[PDB]
Design an enzyme around this catalytic site. Structure first.
Site, mmCIF file in Angstrom:
data_model
loop_
_atom_site.group_PDB
_atom_site.id
_atom_site.type_symbol
_atom_site.label_atom_id
_atom_site.label_comp_id
_atom_site.label_asym_id
_atom_site.label_seq_id
_atom_site.Cartn_x
_atom_site.Cartn_y
_atom_site.Cartn_z
ATOM 1 C CG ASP A 35 -1.869 1.185 1.250
ATOM 2 O OD1 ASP A 35 -1.914 1.922 0.253
ATOM 3 O OD2 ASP A 35 -2.551 1.341 2.297
ATOM 4 C CB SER A 199 -1.674 14.248 -13.649
ATOM 5 O OG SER A 199 -2.036 14.012 -14.973
#
Ligand SMILES: CCCc1nccc(N)n1
Length: 330
Positions: A35, A199
């Site tokens: 994770d 992004s």
């Protein structure tokens, strides 16, 4: 040193991935959910409330000659999906894919929430976010990656998740055979303890690329791709009959649909998520309404590049003095 381990989807939908981990002496092999959005290595154990164990493999510290109680230490964590677990702490030897760390904090669950109990395939979590998020009190503990880092050939790990197929986690090296083209690196903020990046934009199907900054986290422990409501509405508008359902808890679409791809920007580079990756199947057994793999982050407070996004790429988690992320197509 290096390590290399295969990661396997737990079900036909790629809801999560499990990686075998050796704990203790002699080894006890547990299948953990790696994770990159949390920082605790915790396991089902001989201490877990008996009624909360249903088919998981348990760690028994009393059978490990290298286990030591970390006196006074406790832990307690809550995840974004509302699940939780808590307990006490041992140090023990932990190996992943041939890479060994001695003195790793192994957080032994005394209590787990119902979602953990109900999932027989996940024996615990191995956190790979920054150690500043580790929940152990009163002395915060280091992740497996942070403890291994100095020993590794290069201070990196990579995630190569499969679509409906096994993949790989590598520690200490970049497998140049595992991706196509070049790796594009992008800046990371560690201020929230996550692999947080920006992004450069997105496209829907064969549509034009929209240049727009989208701050979010690279999170292997989240199934889906959670993005701003504007972006998500633009995606699902391209699917006949898709709608946001308050009763189901997100966007649903006709199971008869062919989904468009979704592209995200990494610097000047582009990662394409095929449409099929966005199908999470019937909302309930035999339904013709299917659950979408791209959902709104509006109710979260952060955008999450979860497995739907990461499985379309070879992803480098660069733990150098200034961390960075790298993405390649594959
Ligand atoms: C099916 C997603 C993996 C999972 N299992 C149990 C608990 C949790 N938070 N996530």
């Amino acid at each position: 040193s290096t390590g290399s381990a295969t990661t396997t989807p737990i079900d036909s939908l790629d809801d999560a991935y499990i990686t075998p981990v050796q704990i203790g002496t002699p080894a006890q092999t547990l299948n953990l959910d790696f994770d990159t959005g949390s920082s605790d290595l915790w396991v089902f154990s001989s201490e877990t409330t008996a009624s909360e164990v249903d088919g998981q493999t348990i760690y028994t510290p009393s059978k490990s000659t290298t286990a030591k109680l970390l006196s006074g230490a406790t832990w307690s964590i809550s995840y974004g999906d509302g699940s939780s677990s808590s307990g006490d702490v041992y140090t023990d030897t932990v190996s992943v894919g041939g890479l060994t760390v001695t003195g790793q904090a192994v957080e032994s669950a005394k209590k787990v929430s119902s979602s953990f109990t109900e999932d027989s395939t996940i024996d615990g979590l191995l956190g790979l976010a920054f150690s500043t998020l580790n929940t152990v009190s009163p002395t915060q503990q280091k992740t497996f990656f942070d403890n291994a880092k100095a020993s590794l050939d290069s201070p990196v790990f990579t995630a190569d998740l499969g679509y409906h197929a096994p993949g790989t986690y590598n520690f200490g090296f970049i497998d140049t055979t595992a991706y196509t083209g070049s790796i594009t690196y992008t800046a990371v903020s560690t201020k929230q303890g996550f692999w947080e990046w920006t992004s450069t934009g997105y496209a829907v199907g064969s549509g034009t690329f929209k240049s727009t900054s989208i701050d979010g986290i690279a999170d292997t422990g989240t199934t889906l791709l959670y993005l701003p409501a504007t972006v998500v509405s633009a995606y699902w508008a391209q699917v006949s009959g898709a709608k946001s359902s308050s009763s189901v808890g997100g966007y649903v679409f006709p199971c008869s649909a062919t989904l468009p791809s979704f592209t995200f920007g990494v610097g000047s580079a582009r990662i394409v998520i095929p449409g099929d990756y966005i199908d999470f199947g019937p909302i309930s057994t035999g339904s013709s309404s299917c659950f979408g793999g791209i959902q709104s982050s509006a109710g979260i407070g952060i955008n999450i590049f979860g497995d739907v996004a990461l499985k379309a790429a070879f992803v480098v988690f660069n733990g150098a003095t200034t961390p960075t992320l790298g993405f390649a197509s594959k």
